[model samples]
Target chain A: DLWQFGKMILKETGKLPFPYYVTYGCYCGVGGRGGPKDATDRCCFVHDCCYGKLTSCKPKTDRYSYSRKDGTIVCGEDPCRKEICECDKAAAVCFRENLDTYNKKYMSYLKSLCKKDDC
Target chain B: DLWQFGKMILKETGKLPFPYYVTYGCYCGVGGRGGPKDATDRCCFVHDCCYGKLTSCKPKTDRYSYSRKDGTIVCGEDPCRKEICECDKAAAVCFRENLDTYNKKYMSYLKSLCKKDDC
Candidate 1:
């Protein structure tokens, strides 16, 4: 993945440059204006704060109203982080399936070694 | 910051949500917009991809035309990362000054202990 390669350079550098990856976290953006109901994972880059705030800290006020799939406005915490494991199930399955196929020869060798034992 | 508190929760949980903070990197956003001259550090959140594209990977093509402080449009790699250490100088100064104050008593104790342990 291009992103993975980007991370490789970040790993090589002990400190990330000015705009760096702050965190890999989740947030909700669709509480209003008929936006989509689901949250997403993303990679973001740095941009300036508003109105030339001229401060070390950037303060933003973004109000959100979350909704479920049924389009009903709901009140609660974001489900983004909670759904990660389930979302990654496909990738996990692929990894395990590949592992099974990859280890077949090793497993075969173990089988032969076991058969030759107990003499 | 609200973001920091949000991150605390993320740390308590192992997995991130469906939409997560991807990266906090810098980009050349002002290549053509007559935008500000400098890049900034930022934390970002995830949003949906465009146009109902329905793709696993989000792809974007943003063109940039960077202008140095003197209003000369230049072409080269981003200077954002390079400027990070310089930007953090203020924070570094505060840290060092605090460190000196914090260690003053400890340093005195160590000096006294060293004088008593000449054997």
Candidate 2:
């Protein structure tokens, strides 16, 4: 659909490192059982779709890595690497844009709603 | 010195609607007595200075107004209006850029650190 194509163009041409999903609500993959609570969750959902699209392009042995310093994801040089990078970048942008939404819904010192493995 | 000048340039040109103050810490005007708790506070401090600089450019009777919808500021059509608009824009950008810092320090449903009159 146009949703996926729009995200691809935004990343590929560099207008935006990642594109925003205007219609997509929050929820990533099969997680967030109750559905997206806010924009941050939606970002994760977009990430899930982005990764799903690369199933045919990536090797079975290949996997995503993370930076120890800032905890950012790092992709290796592979056929699907570019798409993978764009997915991460888009998710990052989504998180940044919706920081307020995330904070309002999930920020807590005593108890965070975010799961350990989520997003 | 250069801080004020840099802000002016950013506002006058179109690169950024308002400029970020690199050296200024988080404290707006006479408020936030303990100093900046994080980046959001710094953004308010920058706004204070921005308004202060216009002391010489604005009329005594003129004042800034606000929109009830989103609480965004609305500047009057006066000689200093452009500068005032830029100041608000800059502060908005600063707040957006530092949203995480804000969430970490002040996001509390029960006890917000933010004061009634504080920016």
Highest lDDT: give the candidate number: 2
**Candidate 1, A1-119: lDDT as tens digits:** 21322222233332221112222112111111122111111211111111123243212221223233453223234243223222222222322233323321221121112210000
User: Model 2, range B3-117, lDDT digits (tens) per residue?
Assistant: 2323333443322211122212334312234356566656666676777788766422234443324544344455575676667667766665664554422321111333332
Model 1 chain B — which ten-residue stretch has the worst lDDT?
B42-51
Off by over 4 Å in 1: A1-9, A12-18, A23-119, B1-89, B100-119
Docking class of 1: incorrect
Kindly give the number of clashing pairs for every candidate.
Answer: 18, 3
List fnat, each candidate.
0.00, 0.00
Interface RMSD in angstroms for candidate 2: 14.0
TM-score of each candidate? 0.15, 0.28
Candidate 2 C-alpha lDDT tens digits along A1-119: 12232333344333321112221233331233335656665666666677778777642223444332454334445556556666766766666666455432232111123333343
Candidate 2: misplaced stretches above 4 Å? A1-30, A57-77, A104-119, B1-119
Name the top DockQ candidate: 1
What DockQ do you compute for every candidate structure?
A: 0.03, 0.02
